[model samples]
Target: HMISKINGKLFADMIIQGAQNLSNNADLVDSLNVYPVPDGDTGTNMNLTMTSGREEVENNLSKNIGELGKTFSKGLLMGARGNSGVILSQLFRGFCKNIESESEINSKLLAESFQAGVETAYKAVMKPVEGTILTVAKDAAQAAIEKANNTEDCIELMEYIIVKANESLENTPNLLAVLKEVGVVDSGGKGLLCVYEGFLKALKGEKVEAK
Candidate 1:
């Protein structure tokens, strides 16, 4: 079954699954942080932030994507923690904004929302480092947009974006000296990838749970 369009209920499921995946991989993501200090908390911050967003959407589940996106965005904003979490919140904030009037979302709108999220997240950062989550998001969004042009299937678009995101994550160390020196990818990027993987799983009707 090809999922060509995503509704609020499906989107909410994705949010829940994404949060669960993040929670399961939180410690791993935290360990990947090598810059500034090794006492990594990026995973915890992102996990908590995603959890908050999921809770809001769960409580206010709707058939309208506009309504659900608004609730999810507000929750992420209010529960944001640390720089990573703040950027994550902004990404979804922009994404929701783009879809505010949409009852359902197709591949094109989804890609555009991702692009908007990258723009918003980039603006939120002061320095806007190139090798962090921002770069990963930018790469993935661009890939999504390109893929959307060839396919109307949301699942196909999302899968392509995930592939690009993973590729970008692997290349992060090459972009940042600290990451290269530490021999690890960007922690934030990895966290974001985890969320994306969860989204794909939801689209596939697969179960997701924190392990």
Candidate 2:
């Protein structure tokens, strides 16, 4: 059965799984970094950022997701390393801001939170490139918003968002010439998708063991 709402405990589990998934796939995401001079550490930075957020959620377990979200956002912001890390932190910070007063979140609120995150993330970056993580989040959140009208199931909304994120990820190369030249997608975008995939697994009551 699909879950109608997400509580603090479930959100914590999702974040932990997300951190694990990102940690496992960090190397892959690093390898995809062919654009912007290719330092190839986006994955490590994102993993560290996510790990910090996950630890905060673990330490502050609660039935109120609002409290957990605040804790997680603060952790991510403090532990943010590189540009990608900062952007990632900002994304979740905005997401948490929207739900800070809510005890739990349903599909509509979840979609709105995603949109809010994208908006904040875009504002964080002065330029806001179309082929980066910002674009991926925007596309996925838009899809989720549209899907929310039809389903109240958070699981179903998340599933649709993931599919849209993947499609946006695939098209990143088309938007960025550098990515197309190197034959790779956006590294940051891939990292975000990995996290979202982890979220999906948690929602489905599936265990995601670290690799």
Candidate 3:
């Protein structure tokens, strides 16, 4: 939802805000889920994952697009944690590298960044399976790329990517039989989308609105 609703530096700042909000409310988030294992600390893991990138953005404070990308990649590398966190880190890491030198970004930049994220995630994992975040990232990245065109309007780009991600998310169950059997999409993928939606909400900058 977020990836489609906004673009450029707004997308970047939204992640910072959303992650910080979630990071501070990790306990509240943890209470909402019934954990099957210790990996249940989804909020914790993602918070840590994002902090890596956030730290980079803060440290550099650079208007140079390339510098921001470089900082983002390094920060995520050091802060990544458990399997889920690590996976999430790679997704953003790809985005960082893809937008190496941009004062601002648009839809095409997002498409490239997302694709880079997918590729990074794919390489990080020992086996690129279809049953997990890899599938969602790949699908969403592919979909997002279609929207990366000559248009420079941030809103147009974000809307296209979000719609694409949602379309892919709806089909996730079909990729993994177990997800279908369990009547759920991949948790990590759903989590990713949730963050994406949060990103959109923040992009709107309205205190109260459809989330």
Give TM per candidate. 0.96, 0.96, 0.76
lDDT of each: 0.90, 0.89, 0.66
lDDT of 3 by residue, 9-84 (tens): 5545666665665565554444433343666566577677777777777766665655666777787788887666
Q: Name the better of 1 and 3 by TM-score.
A: 1
Alpha-carbon RMSD of each model: 1.5, 1.5, 4.3
Cα lDDT tens digits, model 2, 1-211, are 8989999889988898888999999999888876434443889889989999988888889889999999999889877977677788888899999999999999999999999998998776678778988889899999999999989998889999999999999999999899999899999999999999999999999978878
Residue 5 of model 2 has an lDDT of 91
Report the lDDT tens digits of candidate 1 across residue range 98-159: 99999999999999999999999877667777998889999999999899998988888889
Q: Given candidate 2, what's the lDDT at residue 120?
A: 92
Model 2 residue 18 lDDT?
86
lDDT of 2: 0.89
